[PDB]
Structures are given as C-alpha cells and as structure tokens.
C-alpha cells in the first residue's frame with residue numbers, strides 16, 4: 801500500500817504530540833516529553849484507499865516529508881504568529897512554493913479562544929491551503945486534519 805510521509809510542525813505546546821497520539825493510540829495524552837521527536841506508523845483507509853501514514857512528530861526525515869500539518873493553538877496568539885515561520889521553512893526544505901499542507905487550529909474545546917476562526921481561515925486562504933479546527937482532547941477534527949492532508953498530497 802502507498803506510504804505517505806507526514807510531518808507535524810508548530811510552536812511548543814500546541815498539541816503536535818497529542819494530535820499524533822490521539823490519531824494513532826486513540827487517547828488524549830496528559831503530557832508528552834517535549835524533547836521526543838520520532839515517527840509513528842498508522843494503517844488507515846481514506847476515501848476507499850488503504851494506506852500507511854508515516855507521521856513525523858517534530859520537537860523544537862524532516863526533508864523527506866510529503867505533507868505537513870502546520871499546527872497552532874487557538875488559545876495561543878504567539879503560536880498562530882509562528883505559523884508563517886514554519887511554512888517558510890517547509891518551502892525551503894522542500895525547494896517548492898506548493899507543498900501539500902494544512903493549517904490546524906488545535907484546542908478548539910477550550911473557552912479561552914484568542915485566535916478567531918475568521919482570522920485562521922483568512923490565513924489559510926492567503927496560503928491557499930485547507931484550514932481545520934481540531935481538539936486532541938475530544939477527537940474533534942483529528943482524523944479530518946490528517947485525512948485532508950493525505951488528500952492534498954493526492955492532488956499534488
């Protein structure tokens with residue numbers, strides 16, 4: 801089956817690990833060593849196509865990434881501001897302005913939202929990529945986030 805090399809990036813504490821573990825292990829991790837950077841495998845069916853996801857969970861194989869999740873936390877304006885810095889890195893590492901990518905706004909279950917949906921959507925539109933609100937806690941949008949990225953790779 802087709803192997804998709806996915807990579808999760810973003811500021812520290814946005815939920816990169818929590819999203820990866822929730823997708824794969826199907827549980828919400830209370831805490832994850834911020835210094836652990838490793839890849840995790842996951843067999844999955846997307847639109848009737850079975851495939852293996854090789855998900856590199858980065859910590860603050862990178863270059864071989866076929867698709868990237870740019871994650872920020874909706875209760876963290878700084879992490880949202882950091883997004884551009886991460887997208888530009890991916891552009892340079894892949895030597896391409898058109899890399900498969902999705903903007904993820906995590907922790908959408910928290911009431912202390914400081915980054916509006918409209919604000920995040922506009923940024924996604926400026927990048928020409930999909931935007932997806934997620935919660936590693938409740939599982940909202942988690943599958944959709946990774947699956948949409950696979951779909952973006954298929955287009956490319």
Ligand SMILES: Nc1nc2c(ncn2[C@@H]2O[C@H](COP(=O)(O)OP(=O)(O)O)[C@@H](O)[C@H]2O)c(=O)[nH]1
Nearest residue numbers: 812813814815816817818830832907935936937
């Ligand atoms: N409420 C809430 N907390 C989250 C969510 N995702 C991650 N966290 C918390 O944020 C902290 C750091 O998450 P982590 O996965 O390590 O983010 P990372 O540093 O980018 O890998 C942990 O204490 C998690 O419990 C979420 O969707 N909702």
Ligand SMILES: [Ca+2]
Nearest residue numbers: 816817833834
């Ligand atoms: Ca982590």
Ligand code: NA
Nearest residue numbers: 837858859860
């Ligand atoms: Na790293």
